[PDB]
Amino acid sequence: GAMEGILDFSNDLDIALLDQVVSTFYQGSGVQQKQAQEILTKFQDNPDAWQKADQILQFSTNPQSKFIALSILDKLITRKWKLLPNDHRIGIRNFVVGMIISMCQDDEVFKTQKNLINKSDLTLVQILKQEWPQNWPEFIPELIGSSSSSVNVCENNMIVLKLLSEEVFDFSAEQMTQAKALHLKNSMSKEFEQIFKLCFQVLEQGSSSSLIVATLESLLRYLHWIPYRYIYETNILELLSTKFMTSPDTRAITLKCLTEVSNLKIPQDNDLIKRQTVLFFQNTLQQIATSVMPVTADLKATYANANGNDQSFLQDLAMFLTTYLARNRALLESDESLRELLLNAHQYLIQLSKIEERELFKTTLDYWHNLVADLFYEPLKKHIYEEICSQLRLVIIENMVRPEEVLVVENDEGEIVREFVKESDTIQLYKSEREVLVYLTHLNVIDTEEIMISKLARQIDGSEWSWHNINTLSWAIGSISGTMSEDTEKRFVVTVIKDLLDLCVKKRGKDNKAVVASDIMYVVGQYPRFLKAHWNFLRTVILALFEFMHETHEGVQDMACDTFIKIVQKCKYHFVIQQPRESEPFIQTIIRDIQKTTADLQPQQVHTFYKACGIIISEERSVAERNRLLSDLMQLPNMAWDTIVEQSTANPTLLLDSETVKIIANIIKTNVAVCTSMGADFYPQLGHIYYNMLQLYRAVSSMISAQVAAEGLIATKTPKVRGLRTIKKEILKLVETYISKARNLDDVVKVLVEPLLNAVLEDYMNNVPDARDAEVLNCMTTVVEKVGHMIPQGVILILQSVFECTLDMINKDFTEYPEHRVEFYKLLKVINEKSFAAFLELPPAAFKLFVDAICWAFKHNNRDVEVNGLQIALDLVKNIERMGNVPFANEFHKNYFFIFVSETFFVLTDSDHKSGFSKQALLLMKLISLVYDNKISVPLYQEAEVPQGTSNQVYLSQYLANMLSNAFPHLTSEQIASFLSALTKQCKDLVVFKGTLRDFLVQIKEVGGDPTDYLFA
Amino acid sequence: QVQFKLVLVGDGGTGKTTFVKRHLTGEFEKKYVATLGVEVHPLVFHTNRGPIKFNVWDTAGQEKFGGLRDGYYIQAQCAIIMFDVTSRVTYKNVPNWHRDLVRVCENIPIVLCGNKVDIKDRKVKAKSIVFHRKKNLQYYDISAKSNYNFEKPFLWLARKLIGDPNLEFVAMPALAPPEQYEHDLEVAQTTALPDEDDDL
Amino acid sequence: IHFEPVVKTMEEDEEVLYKVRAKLFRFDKDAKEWKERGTGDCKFLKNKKTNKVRILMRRDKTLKICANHIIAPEYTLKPNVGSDRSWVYACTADIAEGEAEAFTFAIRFGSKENADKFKEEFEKAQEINKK
Ligand SMILES: *[C@H](CC(=O)O)C[C@@H](O)/C=C/C(C)=C\[C@H](C)C/C(C)=C/C=C/[C@@H](O)[C@H]1C[C@@H](O)[C@H](C)[C@H](/C=C/C)O1
Ligand SMILES: Nc1nc2c(ncn2[C@@H]2O[C@H](COP(=O)(O)OP(=O)(O)NP(=O)(O)O)[C@@H](O)[C@H]2O)c(=O)[nH]1
Ligand SMILES: [Cl-]
Ligand SMILES: [Cl-]
Ligand SMILES: [Cl-]
Ligand SMILES: [Mg+2]
């Protein structure tokens, strides 16, 4: 098309055409915009495109064209600057400086082309980073002088200085070498006195809001690093906290400066510096009260109105007040005359804390936690804040977010429904609120009870009744469990439960009953101490929970199950013993009525119920009694199981129907549930079903294969085959669950393992990829983890069955078979950790695949895989090293040392594996340290490839210099040699070593990096 | 038509394109095809104050596909900065994206979004996410996969841009609808629906 | 003495015959894959003036329409190979995005029961539209 013309550099650049393409991209749409975008990207990425920059700057009538022109220069400046001849550098500098001057002089442009001037200034800063001060010593003085001569230029100088401070102090860590960063920070430090002098003068002269605002913006940056004396030994605190607070244009930025000042490094023993720290706060709070709003103002309302910049201002006020008070409030606590100020500051925070804005609330809550935690320990402080704390109790109680346990919510129709999902993001908020509220309760338990009991009274009588009001209250009441005395709690919980029971009678309809039910369940589950002490109450609660297991409201039902297990986890002892005036332990009563009790529950709820019973049963430590309870608990599933192990043993095809497959799955799921809570105690039940279970695993496996053969791979998607695989998966989960908690490892090895391996391994190996269950690998990891040391031949067998066939599934790309990928490297890790001999038994060809597999893991972006890959590599090296000077260790190094070194370097330097840096560096340090310490007994080089007797150290350096030279040909030999010298000398100090690697990663991105940077220390 | 330029930035693989596609068509794209430079998509929402149109500039997060980079931000009226709560490096880089963005766009409403909260093994803890406070950015936990808070960034931005805190999304009106194939249906029947183990 | 005091979804003329939560997919023919189009309440709406029954489905939170078409007498609910809780069927005139367009839809539900109940109702609506 016509637009492609600009890509032909053999002809002169048509600036008009460039402007057309640019405005087509920025102001057009559809296919024309898409085409223009590609053209511009290609234009920009053309390595000679920068030579067109001056031409574009001079002759273009489009600001975006000139912007793109500057991006092209920026890329040149930051990457290839030292490649240029010296006159081109002078030239580029001159027309950048000249353009800035020119655009500042012309008022019209200065006003309307702010994007372009800011971009021009950043580009200037890039030149400074390369050239300043060494080849430009007069930049700052000439900048300072030029300021006096024009208000537009002075203002823009402040922008340039802001950006320079940013680039040097705030964003240099990743982008420069340690040595260059130090150089530029020192350079700014040495000339700062003059920079500040101009800054102070402008602030004092106080002419032009936009110049003042720009000056304060630069100051905000300077405050990240400048010495405190510039702030405390000049009049600058007075100006910030009075003058600049009064004007709204300068108020935003001044508050942020004052927040940063509150963080400066400051002597703790100087009475005067303390007085100055008090005064600026006092000034600032006075200007807010007189110029912005009084302490009584409704900040909730103001924020919600969202006029102008009010929300951002209130946000910044919160940040200032919380930052200052966290550090300095002690300065205000002892002087009687400073008390009004202390409390006014906190009263503003109380008002800020009422704003409806989650993230702001978190900021304030962080502060309250800091306060109350301090009042909990610091002697004689809490009385000061008694009125503040009392108001805080109200704010927190009235803004309690729904706890994870409460499973009901309100929908748009005004109906109380079960939630669709978990409110994942309010979990942390609840914890924080609870923490503060617990502290406040300890600080004044009388005040808290009174507030809650009377709030509750106003729910009953109806004066303040609402779902919102009863919920927040109920959540708050549950959240302070543990704060009161057992006796106060006794009376408290009694009163609260009486009231909530009264509330349930009063408020009818499914919605009101769901709300009140949820709240009572949350409270009772939160006070197990009370439940332990009050059996009749406990029993009645549990029976009440069982009634809810029959509710048609599914939310209430599900919470009944969760509350049941929550109670049981804490109170199980009281279910297992026979209570006074009861004919039997309540566990006996529960098991007996289990069919009736669980009859309306969904299966996963039935499994939770069973899991709870398992918790109780494991309280019984007499083995005879425990096993009997286990057997009684499992009666229904064992009976269903027994009848299926006959029917399906008669008709291997009867597994065809959905209903039987669902039944079987639920039977095994029930076993998993009970095994989860009983752990080692589950064994006898595992023994009842084990062999038939493994036979079932084989039968189901045959069915899956039969179906895939008859229907194709698509069969694996069908409900039928998915149901059969579910059975195999649950069987594997059950065995995993048991072995992971087993205490008798001898029985695991002598009874469980051989039949397990027989049932699962060949089946995995001989199914097509799409039919292999990644869960097999997961089960095997637990087997190796727990008994691998006892089953060396079994480990060999596991490897043989899964290693090559899984590797071939996952080594074509990074995405196919994600679960297998993850479980595969988990299994290799534990085998390498626990049964390294298994790898020694592999033939050389398969061992090579192992090494391939490890390095393949290095190259994953997926963290699960990547991390294990690095760990395996490190553990492997340690395993070899442990063998000492024997032929396998020798051949290992000869074959694979340099493969690991080069592969580790590749992921270190490719810019796509940055999350792995720490472990990559550790691995590389280990590898280099092996040679540096002469822990490799044989030469790493071929005979005659280098002179005889040549040390491995000398050869390593030679190999690496060659490797880097070819991998990074734009580096000089001196850069490489210096890098390697440092890196190799620093191979005992991970912190310094990592620094040197990071410096290398900076230098590979540019040309002409200084090799002396690697001497940094 | 009232339309606003929204630029969307963040590290490669954080879920920018997937988030936008979800809003555009309703789909969840499982594959990672890196964006090359920028993709521009119109995206309309119906509100109680009329239709608001975002022209979404979904930019490339991978450095090698960055294209014009900050050149994309010119004249943006709002922004979303995206990171991945399962990847800490992506949160570490938020200040860098914010820096490059506000240098070109000095006073615009910006939402910070932590994506992929559907994933069990979360790495960037809730408690750690504080960068937004001093920079006045709105923050949300989101998931483009589970649709957790997926609408919140646009609801907030629309409130800020229209200047009405009480703005709500409203149901678009439903026009009465009007009144070989056998090959096409059979291929559809025999292609399995994805994610058969989800709730819906 | 009188004291002066201080000073369209397009579904108002429709009866809701059936409502269920669903996830709706459309078949991309080119790439052979189902892509999600929306999750929310699928409703059967009978117009009071014409007695015609349509499917209207809106996405949660955004409320954007992902399905809007007459329940044509000719359509046929068909099983997907991967699911016992979905139906696939061909639609020749859905107007959710705007202009009248043909799609192959798949619609999945919370349970098989919900799927079966949907089909029962789909067929009932078809008999209404026949009258
Ligand atoms: C609705 C009730 C209604 O009126 O219909 C709510 C109800 O369905 C839910 C009840 C739940 C989940 C728990 C209750 C707390 C269980 C009950 C009713 C326990 C009753 C216990 C009484 O013995 C109780 C009465 C009070 O005087 C106090 C609590 C004493 C406690 C002495 C230690 O005993
Ligand atoms: N689990 C999960 N995965 C997600 C989510 N959002 C996106 N993804 C996945 O993350 C991968 C990358 O998504 P993509 O939208 O391409 O990210 P991007 O930020 O646009 N990458 P780029 O900047 O290179 O264009 C895809 O595989 C996608 O399915 C999410 O919320 N949860
Ligand atoms: Cl511009
Ligand atoms: Cl106990
Ligand atoms: Cl050299
Ligand atoms: Mg993308």
Short mmCIF file of C-alpha atoms in Angstrom, two decimals, chain B residues 25 172-178, chain C residues 11 14 20 22-26 36-45 54-60 63-71 75 89 91 93-98 101 103 105-107 118 122:
data_model
loop_
_atom_site.label_atom_id
_atom_site.label_comp_id
_atom_site.label_asym_id
_atom_site.label_seq_id
_atom_site.Cartn_x
_atom_site.Cartn_y
_atom_site.Cartn_z
CA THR B 25 -16.83 -12.39 23.10
CA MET B 172 -29.28 -3.79 27.32
CA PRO B 173 -32.80 -3.85 25.79
CA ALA B 174 -33.87 -7.08 24.00
CA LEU B 175 -35.26 -6.64 20.46
CA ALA B 176 -37.81 -9.26 19.40
CA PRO B 177 -35.90 -11.84 17.32
CA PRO B 178 -37.01 -12.94 13.79
CA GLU C 11 -39.10 -7.54 28.29
CA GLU C 14 -43.29 -10.98 28.38
CA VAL C 20 -32.23 -21.84 34.73
CA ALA C 22 -26.52 -22.15 32.12
CA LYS C 23 -23.25 -21.78 30.27
CA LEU C 24 -23.62 -21.16 26.55
CA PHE C 25 -21.05 -22.08 23.91
CA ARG C 26 -20.88 -21.48 20.17
CA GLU C 36 -17.90 -19.89 25.64
CA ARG C 37 -20.37 -17.10 24.89
CA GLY C 38 -21.82 -16.48 28.36
CA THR C 39 -22.82 -17.74 31.79
CA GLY C 40 -26.01 -16.59 33.47
CA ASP C 41 -29.76 -17.10 33.61
CA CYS C 42 -31.25 -18.61 30.48
CA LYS C 43 -34.91 -17.55 30.35
CA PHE C 44 -37.88 -18.66 28.25
CA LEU C 45 -39.99 -15.56 27.49
CA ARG C 54 -37.95 -17.02 22.88
CA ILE C 55 -34.72 -17.82 24.65
CA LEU C 56 -33.13 -14.76 26.27
CA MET C 57 -29.87 -15.21 28.11
CA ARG C 58 -27.74 -12.51 29.74
CA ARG C 59 -24.21 -12.64 31.14
CA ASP C 60 -23.82 -12.23 34.90
CA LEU C 63 -26.04 -8.23 31.79
CA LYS C 64 -25.03 -8.40 28.10
CA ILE C 65 -27.25 -10.60 25.94
CA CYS C 66 -25.53 -13.81 24.80
CA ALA C 67 -28.67 -15.47 23.41
CA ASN C 68 -31.82 -14.01 21.79
CA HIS C 69 -33.85 -16.16 19.37
CA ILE C 70 -37.22 -17.78 18.83
CA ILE C 71 -37.44 -21.39 20.04
CA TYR C 75 -34.83 -27.11 16.18
CA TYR C 89 -28.62 -27.48 18.46
CA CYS C 91 -29.87 -21.79 15.38
CA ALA C 93 -31.32 -16.42 13.59
CA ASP C 94 -29.74 -15.24 16.87
CA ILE C 95 -29.52 -11.44 17.29
CA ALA C 96 -27.41 -11.13 20.49
CA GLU C 97 -24.41 -9.41 18.82
CA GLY C 98 -26.69 -7.47 16.43
CA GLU C 101 -26.69 -14.70 12.36
CA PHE C 103 -24.84 -20.45 15.06
CA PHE C 105 -25.02 -23.59 20.05
CA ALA C 106 -24.17 -25.81 23.00
CA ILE C 107 -25.73 -25.12 26.38
CA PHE C 118 -34.62 -27.74 30.05
CA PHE C 122 -37.78 -26.44 25.18
#
